[PDB]
């Protein structure tokens, strides 16, 4: 009865859309800009399943928020690309993106086409990168006391800052161990081989990093030993149980002696399995699947110890720690796949529950971090902080460079760009300067969280950098006085800064190329 053309699809266009997206981007920044600096306070979030997330992490805040607006979905997404890439800097990236997007509407209202602004933004990004590499500082990874200060400068902003001296040791020892050169010349620092285990109770000063692994299992049969000094271990994959085939089988029996003989043949087959394992004389047997009651009887006879139903994620860590490799068929069990690199096997009780320990390895390539503390919520914040530290240490080991922290780099880059823009003639001169001036939102946020004068401190610091050799001066985040970063000792890896600037600039380019919105077309 009615005539239609698009059937219930909304549409917006014009300068309302461009102003609509920018106002949405700034709102997300206003949510998170209180969580920056050593004086940052915490937030608590509520999830659909009733848990509480008391966190300070920039990404953690945003991933528990539901927003309809298309513009906001972009900001949430670039948060997790930063975390997955370099693990640190998920807050400074958001604050920059809002400021770089907010200082652009000034030009739009002066009838300036967006493509003119875009060509100016990406032109300033290249000079941003070159200037950063100029003031880079080379580091010597062989100096342990230098590497402790790198990690300490990245966790003084979190909750574990009270136990900082302990945390740096835990993070550094683990990464120094999982480093692994292998066939060819492929060096890696994979992080699925550094398990983090939480156990409520005790005190946080009871945390330690083990030379090995821990398992939430216990011996199948009580008679089996619980304390071995130098175990010879084998890791299996199949099951020690007479299981059915798959080729559409059936048995037809017409004699008295066929029913009992068939049953006796299953026990002989298992005895074939157990005898073959014994041929290698091990002390510990670890398997992925079930173990029949008969198989335990033969194994306990030969003084073996067995573990049932271990996850595939745990065998791969054990195999790398002890030195064994997993073998599926016992008929192909050899001496090169038996692991003799352990130094102890112990099963303790931790609060009405049994754990299995394999420690004192000769040269492990896998570790298991043990954490104790008040409750689940506190330990949940501990591992989120520890993961950032272990991601920070890795980036140093792949690109040994440093740049001053505390806002020193931003002012150094700001001065360099401004002095370069006065050799530029044309309308692109103005956007080229406002982008550089947008970096100063990093020191400004630090001052406001400290409780100081953001007008007096910033103008004195801008005037400071105008001199010839003062590029390392930054803002102290606890008292509020301009101090040199050489003596205070704050540094962050060069990789973190490069990604923060690159992600921030490119997001502003994306949302500045918008002209209209179409909605509700139902796929």
């Amino acid at each position: 009865p009615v005539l239609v053309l698009s059937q219930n699809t909304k549409r917006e266009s014009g300068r309302k859309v461009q102003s609509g997206n920018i106002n949405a981007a700034k709102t997300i920044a206003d949510i998170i800009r209180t969580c920056l600096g050593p004086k940052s306070m915490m937030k608590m979030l509520l999830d659909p399943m009733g848990g509480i997330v008391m966190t300070n992490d920039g990404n953690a805040i945003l991933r528990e928020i539901q927003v309809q607006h298309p513009a906001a979905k972009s900001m949430i997404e670039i948060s997790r690309t930063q975390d997955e890439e370099v693990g640190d800097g998920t807050t400074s990236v958001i604050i920059l993106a809002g400021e770089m997007l907010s200082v652009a509407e000034h030009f739009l209202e002066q009838q300036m086409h967006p493509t003119v602004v875009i060509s100016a933004y990406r032109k300033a990004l290249d000079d941003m990168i070159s200037t950063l590499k100029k003031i880079s500082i080379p580091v010597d990874i062989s100096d342990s006391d230098m590497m402790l200060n790198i990690i300490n400068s990245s966790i003084t902003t979190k909750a574990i800052s009270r136990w900082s001296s302990l945390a740096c040791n835990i993070a550094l020892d683990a990464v120094k161990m999982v480093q692994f050169e292998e066939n060819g010349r492929k060096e890696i620092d994979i992080k699925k081989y550094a398990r983090v285990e939480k156990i409520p109770g005790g005190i946080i000063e009871d945390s330690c990093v083990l030379r090995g692994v821990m398992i939430n299992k216990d011996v199948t049969h009580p008679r089996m030993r619980r304390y071995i000094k130098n175990p010879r271990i084998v890791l299996l994959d199949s099951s020690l149980e007479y299981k059915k085939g798959e080729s559409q089988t059936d048995i037809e029996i017409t004699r008295e002696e066929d029913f009992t003989r068939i049953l006796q043949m299953e026990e002989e087959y298992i005895q074939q399995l157990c005898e073959d394992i014994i041929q290698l004389k091990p002390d510990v047997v670890i398997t992925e699947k079930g173990i029949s009651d008969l198989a335990q009887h033969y194994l306990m006879r030969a003084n073996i110890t067995a573990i049932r139903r271990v996850r595939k994620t745990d065998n791969n860590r054990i195999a790398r720690a002890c030195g064994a490799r997993i073998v599926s068929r016992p008929e192909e069990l050899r001496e090169d796949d038996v692991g003799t690199g352990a130094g102890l096997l112990e099963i303790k009780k931790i609060g009405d529950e049994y754990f299995t320990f394999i420690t004192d390895c000769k040269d492990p390539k896998a570790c298991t971090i043990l954490l104790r503390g008040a409750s689940k919520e506190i330990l949940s914040e501990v591992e989120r902080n520890l993961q950032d530290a272990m991601q920070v240490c890795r980036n140093v080991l792949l690109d040994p460079q440093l740049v001053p922290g505390g806002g020193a780099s931003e002012m150094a880059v700001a001065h360099a760009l401004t002095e370069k823009s006065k050799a530029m003639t044309g309308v692109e001169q103005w956007p080229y300067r406002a982008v550089a001036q947008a970096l100063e939102v990093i020191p400004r946020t630090l001052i406001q969280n400290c409780g100081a004068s953001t007008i007096r401190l910033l103008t004195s610091l801008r005037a400071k950098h105008t001199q010839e050799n003062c590029e390392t001066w930054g803002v102290n985040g606890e008292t509020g006085t301009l101090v040199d970063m050489k003596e205070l000792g704050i540094w962050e890896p060069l990789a973190v800064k490069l990604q923060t600037y690159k992600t921030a600039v490119e997001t502003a380019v994306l949302l500045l190329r918008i002209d209209d919105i179409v909605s509700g077309h139902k796929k």
Binding site: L5, S6, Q7, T9, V518
Partner: protein, 56 residues
């Protein structure tokens, strides 16, 4: 991308669905200029209509 936009919209007027597959065909045959073709086709109709309103 002109072809991508039109494919994602919901249209039921038969006079418009002809243009949606017009841009789709330009994608397969060539792969560029899928927005130029739609503009030209709609301008040819509009300009020809005034000729038909006059007794031609």
């Amino acid at each position: 991308d002109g072809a991508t936009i039109l494919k994602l919209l919901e249209v039921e007027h038969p006079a418009a669905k002809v243009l949606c597959e017009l841009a789709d065909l330009q994608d397969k045959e060539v792969g560029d200029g899928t927005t130029s073709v739609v503009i030209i086709a709609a301008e040819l109709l509009k300009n020809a209509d005034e000729l038909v309103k006059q007794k031609i």
